[PDB]
Amino acid sequence: ENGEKITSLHREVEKVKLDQKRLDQELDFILSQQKELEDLLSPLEELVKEQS
């Protein structure tokens, strides 16, 4: 009875650890794609500033 709970528990520690590590890598991919977007945007901000 105690062993089944502690083994099912050990399996659900390792699940959340894997899912937390996945979110870190998905955040790192967003932060890089935000830099591609911010670096596509600046060339348009400059063109308007010359036209005003």
Partner: protein
């Protein structure tokens, strides 16, 4: 193997971190939703740069300008107008629904303040009339579910084993005047306990053996050699210590 206490500390310390592993999993599933939202707003951003890029090239065409008189609203100016229409209609309806709830609460205040001027006891009956309704809804769904099981058994889509079901109870009054009602309830109980009936037949004849099973046992037994099963004496007295 251990003490009664060590085997109990293993249970309680298991259940205290099982509770945390749900708490921290729920934050891990919450943050994945907020990260999935942020990936969506990032693609709304990637679209916005191309929307702006194309818009900037169209603004240089000397043939475009003469068509602008008949242009619809832009899809943000129309959307802010659709939200202003939605908010105006909500602010219009919610003013009516707040006023109608406040008139309902005040008709019920006028009714309670009427009811007060002619004496006691409704508050006991709302409780029991709600328990009477709940127990009826329980009997209704139970009968509907049993008809669904009957239909699934008729269709050969559900085969079943066996299950059972519960019973009620009630407590007594205390304060001094119902003795004869319990004693009449016990006397009518005892009068309804009083004696029942009889039966007669021949004994059921024991089942015949299948003639095939009987012929199989004849032929099993006729071939078996039958060496005797002796009372076993110890097979060596020549291992005595004298």
């Amino acid at each position: 193997v251990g003490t009664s206490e060590e085997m109990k500390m293993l249970r309680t310390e298991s259940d205290d971190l099982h509770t945390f592993l749900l708490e921290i999993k729920e934050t891990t599933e919450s943050l994945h939703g907020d990260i999935s939202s942020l990936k969506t707003t990032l693609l709304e951003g990637f679209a916005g740069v191309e929307e702006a890029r194309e818009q900037n090239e169209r603004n240089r065409d000397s043939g475009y300008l003469h068509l602008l008189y008949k242009r619809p609203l832009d899809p943000k100016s129309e959307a802010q107008l659709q939200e202003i229409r939605r908010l105006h209609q909500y602010v219009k309806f919610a003013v009516q629904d707040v006023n109608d709830v406040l008139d309902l609460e005040w008709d019920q205040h006028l009714e309670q303040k009427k009811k007060q001027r002619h004496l006691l006891v409704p508050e006991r009956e709302t409780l029991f009339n709600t328990l009477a309704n709940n127990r009826e809804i329980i009997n209704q769904q139970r009968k509907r579910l049993n008809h669904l099981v009957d239909s699934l058994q008729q269709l050969r889509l559900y085969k079943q084993t066996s299950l059972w079901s519960l019973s009620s109870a009630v407590p007594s009054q205390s304060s001094i005047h119902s003795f004869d009602s319990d004693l009449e309830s016990l006397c009518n109980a005892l009068l309804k306990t009083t004696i029942e009936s009889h039966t007669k037949s021949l004994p059921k004849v024991p089942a015949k053996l299948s003639p095939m099973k009987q012929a199989q046992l004849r032929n099993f037994l006729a071939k078996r050699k039958t060496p005797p099963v002796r009372s076993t004496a110890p097979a060596s007295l020549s291992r005595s210590a004298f």
